[PDB]
Amino acid sequence: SRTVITEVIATADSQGRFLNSTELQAAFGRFERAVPAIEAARALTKNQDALVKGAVQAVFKKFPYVTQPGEKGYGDSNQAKCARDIGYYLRFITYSLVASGTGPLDDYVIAGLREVNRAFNLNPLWYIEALNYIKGETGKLLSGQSKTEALLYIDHAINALS
Amino acid sequence: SRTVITEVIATADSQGRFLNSTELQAAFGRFERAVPAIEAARALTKNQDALVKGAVQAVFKKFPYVTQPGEKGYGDSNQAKCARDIGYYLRFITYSLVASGTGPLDDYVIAGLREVNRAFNLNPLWYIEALNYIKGETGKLLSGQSKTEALLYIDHAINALS
Amino acid sequence: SRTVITEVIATADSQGRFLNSTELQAAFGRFERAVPAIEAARALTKNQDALVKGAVQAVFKKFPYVTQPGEKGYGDSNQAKCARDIGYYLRFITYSLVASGTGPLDDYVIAGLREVNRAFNLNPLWYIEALNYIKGETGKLLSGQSKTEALLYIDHAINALS
Amino acid sequence: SRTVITEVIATADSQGRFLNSTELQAAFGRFERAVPAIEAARALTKNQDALVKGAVQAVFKKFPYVTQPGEKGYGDSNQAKCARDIGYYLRFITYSLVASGTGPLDDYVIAGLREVNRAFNLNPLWYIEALNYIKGETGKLLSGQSKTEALLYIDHAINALS
Amino acid sequence: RIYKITVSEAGAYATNKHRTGYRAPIRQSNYTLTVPYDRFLPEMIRLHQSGAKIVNVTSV
Amino acid sequence: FLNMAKDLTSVSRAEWLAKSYTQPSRYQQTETFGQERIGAVGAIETPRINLRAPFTSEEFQGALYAIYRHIFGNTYVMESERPTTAESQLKDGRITVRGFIRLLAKSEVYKSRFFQKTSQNRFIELSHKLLLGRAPYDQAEISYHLDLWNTQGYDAEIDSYVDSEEYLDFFGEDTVPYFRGFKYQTGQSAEGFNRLVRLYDGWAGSDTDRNVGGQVARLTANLTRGGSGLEPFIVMANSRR
Amino acid sequence: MNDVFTRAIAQADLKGSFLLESDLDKLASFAKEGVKRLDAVAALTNNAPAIISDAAHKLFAEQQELIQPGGNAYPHRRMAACLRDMEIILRYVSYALLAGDASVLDDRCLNGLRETYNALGTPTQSVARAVQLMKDAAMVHLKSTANVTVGDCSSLYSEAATYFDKAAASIA
Amino acid sequence: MNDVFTRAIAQADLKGSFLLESDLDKLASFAKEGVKRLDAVAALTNNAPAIISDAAHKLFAEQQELIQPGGNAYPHRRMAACLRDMEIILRYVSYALLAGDASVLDDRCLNGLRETYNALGTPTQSVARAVQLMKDAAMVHLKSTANVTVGDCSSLYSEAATYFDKAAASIA
Amino acid sequence: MNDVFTRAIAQADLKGSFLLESDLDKLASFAKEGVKRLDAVAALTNNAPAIISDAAHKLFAEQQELIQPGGNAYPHRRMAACLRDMEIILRYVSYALLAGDASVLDDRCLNGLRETYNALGTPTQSVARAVQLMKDAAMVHLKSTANVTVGDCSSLYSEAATYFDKAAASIA
Ligand SMILES: CCC1=C(C)/C(=C/C2=NC(=C\c3[nH]c(/C=C4\NC(=O)[C@H](C)[C@H]4CC)c(C)c3CCC(=O)O)/C(CCC(=O)O)=C2C)NC1=O
Ligand SMILES: CCC1=C(C)/C(=C/C2=NC(=C\c3[nH]c(/C=C4\NC(=O)[C@H](C)[C@H]4CC)c(C)c3CCC(=O)O)/C(CCC(=O)O)=C2C)NC1=O
Ligand SMILES: CCC1=C(C)/C(=C/C2=NC(=C\c3[nH]c(/C=C4\NC(=O)[C@H](C)[C@H]4CC)c(C)c3CCC(=O)O)/C(CCC(=O)O)=C2C)NC1=O
Ligand SMILES: CCC1=C(C)/C(=C/C2=NC(=C\c3[nH]c(/C=C4\NC(=O)[C@H](C)[C@H]4CC)c(C)c3CCC(=O)O)/C(CCC(=O)O)=C2C)NC1=O
Ligand SMILES: CCC1=C(C)/C(=C/C2=NC(=C\c3[nH]c(/C=C4\NC(=O)[C@H](C)[C@H]4CC)c(C)c3CCC(=O)O)/C(CCC(=O)O)=C2C)NC1=O
Ligand SMILES: CCC1=C(C)/C(=C/C2=NC(=C\c3[nH]c(/C=C4\NC(=O)[C@H](C)[C@H]4CC)c(C)c3CCC(=O)O)/C(CCC(=O)O)=C2C)NC1=O
Numbered sequence A, B, C, D: 001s002r003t004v005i006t007e008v009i010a011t012a013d014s015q016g017r018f019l020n021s022t023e024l025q026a027a028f029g030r031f032e033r034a035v036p037a038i039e040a041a042r043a044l045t046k047n048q049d050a051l052v053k054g055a056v057q058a059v060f061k062k063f064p065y066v067t068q069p070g071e072k073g074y075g076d077s078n079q080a081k082c083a084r085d086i087g088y089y090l091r092f093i094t095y096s097l098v099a100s101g102t103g104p105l106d107d108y109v110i111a112g113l114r115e116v117n118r119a120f121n122l123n124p125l126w127y128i129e130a131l132n133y134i135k136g137e138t139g140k141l142l143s144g145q146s147k148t149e150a151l152l153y154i155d156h157a158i159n160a161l162s
Numbered sequence E: 001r002i003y004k005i006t007v008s009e010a011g012a013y014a015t016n017k018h019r020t021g022y023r024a025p026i027r028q029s030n031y032t033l034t035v036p037y038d039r040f041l042p043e044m045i046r047l048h049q050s051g052a053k054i055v056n057v058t059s060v
Numbered sequence F: 001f002l003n004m005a006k007d008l009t010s011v012s013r014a015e016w017l018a019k020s021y022t023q024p025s026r027y028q029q030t031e032t033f034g035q036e037r038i039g040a041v042g043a044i045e046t047p048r049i050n051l052r053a054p055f056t057s058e059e060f061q062g063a064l065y066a067i068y069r070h071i072f073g074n075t076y077v078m079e080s081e082r083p084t085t086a087e088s089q090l091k092d093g094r095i096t097v098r099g100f101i102r103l104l105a106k107s108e109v110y111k112s113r114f115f116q117k118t119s120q121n122r123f124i125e126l127s128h129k130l131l132l133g134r135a136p137y138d139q140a141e142i143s144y145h146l147d148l149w150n151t152q153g154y155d156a157e158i159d160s161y162v163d164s165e166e167y168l169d170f171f172g173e174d175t176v177p178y179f180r181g182f183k184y185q186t187g188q189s190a191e192g193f194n195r196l197v198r199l200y201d202g203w204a205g206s207d208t209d210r211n212v213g214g215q216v217a218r219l220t221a222n223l224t225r226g227g228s229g230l231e232p233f234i235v236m237a238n239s240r241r
Numbered sequence G, H, I: 001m002n003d004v005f006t007r008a009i010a011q012a013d014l015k016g017s018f019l020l021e022s023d024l025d026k027l028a029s030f031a032k033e034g035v036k037r038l039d040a041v042a043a044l045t046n047n048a049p050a051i052i053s054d055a056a057h058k059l060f061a062e063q064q065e066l067i068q069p070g071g072n073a074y075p076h077r078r079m080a081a082c083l084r085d086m087e088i089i090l091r092y093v094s095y096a097l098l099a100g101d102a103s104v105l106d107d108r109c110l111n112g113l114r115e116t117y118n119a120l121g122t123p124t125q126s127v128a129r130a131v132q133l134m135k136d137a138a139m140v141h142l143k144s145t146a147n148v149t150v151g152d153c154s155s156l157y158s159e160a161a162t163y164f165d166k167a168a169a170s171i172a
């Protein structure tokens, strides 16, 4: 996964050279930023259920029509899959927070996203609404830097969806 | 030159993507570590004259035969060139400290070092001894992390020599 | 190894064509130059021990400091390795004389020479002095075309070192 | 072999796409004009004996010098394999007619034609004459679309022989 | 002998690359390619197949 | 049964399905699973080196390292064998990365490692691997390249690879060649993946001519046959037994 | 690549003979039914997204084990590769249906697919099941009469079934 | 490649689970103790020529047959390749030490190394001995207490030893 | 690639020694007879089309099954491949004659040729027969007294025969 340490190692390895001061300072920045990111991930994990339920209902609020019979948001299975997908997004965002890089989101959600959504007729706007929700509440669940890392990762996912 | 910021932006450009958390954290580490590096730069610049003369004396102590006639170090012109080269190394170490990267050393010293030294029959052990003296005297008048940075850059230069 | 015959055959092979008059003429010149070259090789084989001892003593004469304690010429093992290395160079020079091409020297000595002398901190100038001594002595062992063949291979090795 | 169906399928495969409208309508045209082509194939199969004997004699008339002793056409075996080669040419023209593509002519005759003729010293003008006689006959044997279909392949073979 | 070709693209290459998609990172249109005589024939027709346009061919 | 009935009816269907969806699979397969099996994680995830006309010393030296690692098959090239004039021409902008690759593959390094002590089958599969980042897709490629070298020579045969539409569409004058055939390519023959796997020897493998047996071909029978020859019997086995 | 015409020509050349009149009759019959064959191929082409989506839905409902965390179609890129493979195989079945011969499907698509899947760790039984589900979904659009003149095409349906079965049995 | 964090994340994904509190505590400990890891990596990097030279001297002092005519480091080219190998392995051990994970040794440094040596004919026992000697010569520079704040780095020494031993055991 | 000189040198290097006086005498005799060797190589090169043509004519007169439909040289592409192969083998026999060593013949031509022919369905007995017939035609041309100085060249004749025999044995 593309993280600070991993890109450091990969760039040094592609040039066949040891780890120098530049890369060690990048690693130092990662190790220092770990504390805000890890406790932001802690906060996001502790509140996963409320976040996911609020996100699903926010999607149903901004897209009322999907709830009606005959289209995507109708049925117990479809809404369980909505909840599962939003939980997937939250899970990989917390993963990226912990790993200090967009790696987990890049490799698990963003690689192959458009093809899969197109094949299954899934609107990226639903997930954008859910992630804007999660963004809004992660604003008040987090303070200081932790809010900052959480929102960089959430906005990275949103940008990937658009 | 290869700094933290330049490596960040080059990696981001190579994928054709914006600058994100996995790059901003590296830049943050650079900005955190800037203060010891600049302090070490001041310390190395203020003591440059004594450092250079002592390094030349260390070279002539470790390799006495060089001073004998018919050898490289005989003559005032050769010894002036010795002082000039040690000053070059010290100056570019200060540059590398300031830029928080091996870029100044790589671009101005390391690139072409071996061929240039071989052509003019310059022994890299002379410069290794001078840099070892500079490392020893950097053990004084530098404290804590600034000394760590200076020693890392000097060790980069030494590793490139050998 | 790269000889006259081998370069001829490899040229015709990479071109997908039979050997023509030009390559037969190159081969003819090789087969003629063989008589002086084999005579030179036999002369250098007879006097290999004297040449090695003389080259080692010339190395110690031109670099009196190496034999001092704490440097690479001190100890019986180090000087034995000196004699071994001079023997290697002489043996591969006679190989290149027999083969009518620099192939033995390029393959067995020159390929990797710089990395190895750099790793083990061997000065190329020691070997250059030894080869210059051997050049002078073969100036007295040989004459005519044998002399120029041996000298050409010897100072091919010399330019390889420098 | 390269025929219309094969061309359209291979083009669709190289682009990783399904067979679009143009390829299907081209296949439709191939299927429609199979009837004239199969008619020509059956006609030229029925009259293979007269066509082959006439082509052989036409070659002998236009090249009267090939028959005298010491020449390529002298002998019963050379006669027989003249007939055999012209039979091959007619067989592959019928194959191309059936396939509605020059692929059989390309693969079983044209690919390797010059090298083989040069190796065995066979004048392509001989077979140009024989195919020209067959071209003169097919105008008598065939009508409408069938005549043109066979003429295309005979002209293709004559062009290849040039 | 070697000749220098000045290459430009004004829509044909753009249309082709929009159909096919951006497969290696995008680059500026105008550039100069030096070609020996032996490969002078293919490269130019290659530049014609890619829809590229040439403005000057110099013999040096 | 009582626990099953409490899990079935006592609770609403929505969370029941929700948690059933996120249960772990019996396939315990990470995202890198499958790439790790074939040994191609690094060869897939390494950066694509693109070298423009203006560049710095670090970018230039790193691009040189990548070029020598790929184009010479992870084989050691000593300091004496490195082409200085070609590096200078590339540094000035006289030749592109493509022209540098063309010069390198025409060099005695490449020839001595991949041409001179080999059969033409080995040279052809190896040039496909090194210059196109993919394996030969059929026997027609083998016949085409053997004929081309036999009638025109080594340089024409190298120009066939470097002037190919494939090379320009994927590498195109500025990017170092990389291994393309670990991902599905359009037009691929479903065996080119297996053939690139059989050509690839991991990240620490090389295409040296210094192996004990020598430099020998790998894909001759698979290419000429077009497969393993067990597929008809696989179709039989997928019936009754 | 081999279609019915090239296959007949290859046999005739092996014998060393001109095509017999019965062979010409079979080839003329093939050309006559070519328009119906083209209609079948267009039915497979135009309805490809529907077929793939239907077969994917039924496959992932049948064995949810594949889309769960750890499954082989779990992450977006592996699910995308799954859909891509189904697209590829359906494309090759359409090629084989137009040609009238399974040589293209066997040569370009099936010889190495199974050990590709084994190397990757893909479950080959599930891939074969997906191909069977595409068969079932494709026959529906293959028999659709809208915008097409009514007629009998049972031979075409049998041939397409044998191509899908060839694919499934080669993969499994 | 993986670091410790991505390895924990990958092991958590197979469970469909968020990272646990104990896992987050372990990763917080890893990062909080990261400055010592950086010092250790700098120690390996800055003394790499010394490590390789010391190990090479000892290796060719114990095993003279490697540098005899017929030995596998005999000519300059084979010796040069030997030194390249030692430098590469040490570089990758430093990568692994920075990452806190051995995934970069498995995926890159040792991916096909045993097979390389086996095909070349290289005695893998001598290669493992070279790696052991590099471990012995690298522990000294890791344990050097000069120029660094004093502290307990026994875990870093053990981890580096495991990386060196992993390389040695994968060779032989 | 090797010649007699490089082969002797490689053996001496394995022994770790200088070339002995007997070896130097052998190589001196080789270089002395090199002019005759060049005559033999030119005899092979100048008369190559005649050699291949005669071998092909005799081969296809002996084995008519090779040029019939179903034969391994039936169409022009297969016959051209046959003749191309014959020229390639003759050309590597000429290279080996010049070098005085068969290393290039083994490494380039006969490297995996038996397996290539087996996988192609090429009858290797017939390839060996073709190589024998080229050997005969060549032996006629190398023994020609015209345009040379009469002398004893039986060693060259035997060496060329060994090269042809080694080619035919490697193939079959
Ligand atoms: C690890 C990363 C990952 C993601 C993100 C992912 C999303 C995903 N959701 C799916 C199904 C679905 N997802 C939804 C989501 C909708 N439900 C409605 O209530 C909402 C409006 C909306 C969500 C905001 C629906 C309706 C389906 C069923 C689509 C169908 O089968 O027709 C599918 C198809 C496979 C299946 O049927 O289970 C995928 C691939 N899969 C992954 O492996
Ligand atoms: C399937 C495609 C195919 C073609 C077209 C073909 C032509 C062909 N004809 C041949 C023989 C021959 N063919 C001819 C030509 C005829 N003889 C004369 O009566 C006429 C002037 C002349 C016809 C116009 C001759 C003279 C030979 C004998 C050459 C020899 O001595 O080898 C040979 C050499 C092998 C042999 O049969 O001995 C080939 C390859 N072979 C093929 O496999
Ligand atoms: C280093 C980064 C970089 C840039 C920026 C760049 C610009 C660039 N713009 C192009 C085309 C284009 N660029 C534009 C955009 C302009 N026209 C619109 O009206 C707008 C006013 C305006 C954008 C705000 C358009 C419309 C084209 C298509 C022109 C055509 O096809 O005729 C092309 C040619 C694409 C091809 O031939 O396939 C390039 C190379 N190239 C680079 O390598
Ligand atoms: C990309 C499209 C294209 C172009 C632009 C083209 C023209 C063209 N003509 C060329 C040479 C040539 N062209 C000719 C033409 C003849 N000269 C006179 O005798 C005749 C009146 C005339 C016949 C019409 C000649 C003689 C040469 C050789 C020039 C030389 O080598 O000095 C070359 C260089 C061939 C090479 O170096 O490989 C090109 C590119 N051909 C193409 O396919
Ligand atoms: C540079 C060293 C080298 C050689 C010589 C070599 C031989 C070689 N011969 C081949 C084919 C062939 N080779 C032959 C030759 C046979 N035909 C008759 O049966 C004869 C008994 C016999 C020759 C006297 C034929 C007919 C083919 C066509 C393959 C086929 O049957 O489809 C092929 C496959 C590619 C192609 O079809 O052109 C190779 C690689 N490969 C090498 O790397
Ligand atoms: C031209 C003919 C051809 C085909 C068909 C082909 C298939 C093919 N499928 C692949 C991966 C894959 N294929 C699948 C699909 C399977 N796994 C799912 O669970 C389903 C059960 C099932 C689909 C119904 C998956 C999931 C992968 C990714 C496996 C991995 O990356 O580890 C790959 C590896 C390259 C890549 O990932 O892009 C190939 C080459 N290759 C070819 O050259």
Ligand SMILES: CCC1=C(C)/C(=C/C2=NC(=C\c3[nH]c(/C=C4\NC(=O)[C@H](C)[C@H]4CC)c(C)c3CCC(=O)O)/C(CCC(=O)O)=C2C)NC1=O
Pocket: D021, D024, D025, D028, G032, G035, G036, G038, G039, G040, G042, G142, G143, G144, G145, G148, G149, G150, G151, G152, G153, G156
């Ligand atoms: C645009 C590309 C193109 C296509 C697709 C094409 C096919 C095509 N099929 C036709 C008739 C037909 N089409 C079919 C096939 C049908 N039988 C069943 O009802 C099925 C629903 C279906 C196939 C499974 C049949 C049986 C006929 C009548 C028989 C015939 O006309 O030969 C016709 C009308 C011609 C006529 O009967 O006078 C066309 C144009 N032609 C083209 O140029």
Ligand SMILES: CCC1=C(C)/C(=C/C2=NC(=C\c3[nH]c(/C=C4\NC(=O)[C@H](C)[C@H]4CC)c(C)c3CCC(=O)O)/C(CCC(=O)O)=C2C)NC1=O
Pocket: C059, C066, C072, C073, C074, C078, C079, C080, C081, C082, C083, C085, C088, C089, C108, C109, C116, C120, C121, C122, C126, C127, C130, H057, H060, H067, H073, H074, H075, H076, H079
């Ligand atoms: C076949 C080609 C070949 C050559 C040429 C070669 C040279 C060579 N000499 C060496 C030893 C040595 N060689 C010397 C040099 C001599 N000793 C001193 O008495 C003199 C000042 C000096 C005169 C030139 C020294 C000092 C060593 C010891 C290396 C050390 O311990 O660091 C070594 C290090 C490996 C070992 O321990 O033996 C090499 C590689 N090796 C080869 O395989």
Ligand SMILES: CCC1=C(C)/C(=C/C2=NC(=C\c3[nH]c(/C=C4\NC(=O)[C@H](C)[C@H]4CC)c(C)c3CCC(=O)O)/C(CCC(=O)O)=C2C)NC1=O
Pocket: F074, F075, F076, F077, F203, F204, F205, F206, F208, F210, H066, H072, H073, H077, H078, H079, H081, H082, H083, H085, H086, H088, H089, H108, H109, H110, H111, H113, H116, H120, H122, H123, H126, H127, H128, H130
């Ligand atoms: C993943 C990173 C990576 C590694 C690790 C790597 C190892 C590696 N070492 C090689 C050769 C070699 N390696 C050695 C080293 C051995 N000699 C013995 O004396 C020693 C005990 C031992 C080393 C400590 C030697 C001597 C060769 C040359 C073999 C030869 O020339 O025949 C080769 C083949 C390249 C060539 O021979 O030119 C590789 C691939 N390559 C890589 O890209």
Ligand SMILES: CCC1=C(C)/C(=C/C2=NC(=C\c3[nH]c(/C=C4\NC(=O)[C@H](C)[C@H]4CC)c(C)c3CCC(=O)O)/C(CCC(=O)O)=C2C)NC1=O
Pocket: A021, A024, A025, A028, B033, B148, B149, B152, H035, H036, H038, H039, H040, H042, H142, H143, H144, H145, H148, H149, H150, H151, H152, H153, H156
């Ligand atoms: C530019 C690259 C870079 C490096 C190298 C770096 C190292 C570094 N070493 C530090 C102190 C330290 N360094 C060490 C490590 C040493 N202690 C023992 O002597 C061991 C022998 C040895 C490690 C193997 C220890 C234990 C500390 C104490 C700080 C702590 O444990 O929290 C600190 C924190 C200052 C403090 O609070 O004391 C840093 C940031 N930082 C960087 O940005």
Ligand SMILES: CCC1=C(C)/C(=C/C2=NC(=C\c3[nH]c(/C=C4\NC(=O)[C@H](C)[C@H]4CC)c(C)c3CCC(=O)O)/C(CCC(=O)O)=C2C)NC1=O
Pocket: C021, C024, C025, C028, I035, I036, I038, I039, I040, I042, I142, I143, I144, I145, I148, I149, I150, I151, I152, I153, I156
């Ligand atoms: C242009 C390239 C080139 C060639 C071709 C060449 C050949 C060559 N052949 C020579 C004589 C000779 N050539 C031969 C060989 C022939 N006699 C036997 O009858 C055989 C039929 C046949 C060899 C198979 C012999 C025996 C001599 C006499 C020289 C001697 O015996 O030492 C000579 C010495 C001058 C002379 O006596 O006429 C040369 C230079 N030299 C070259 O630079």
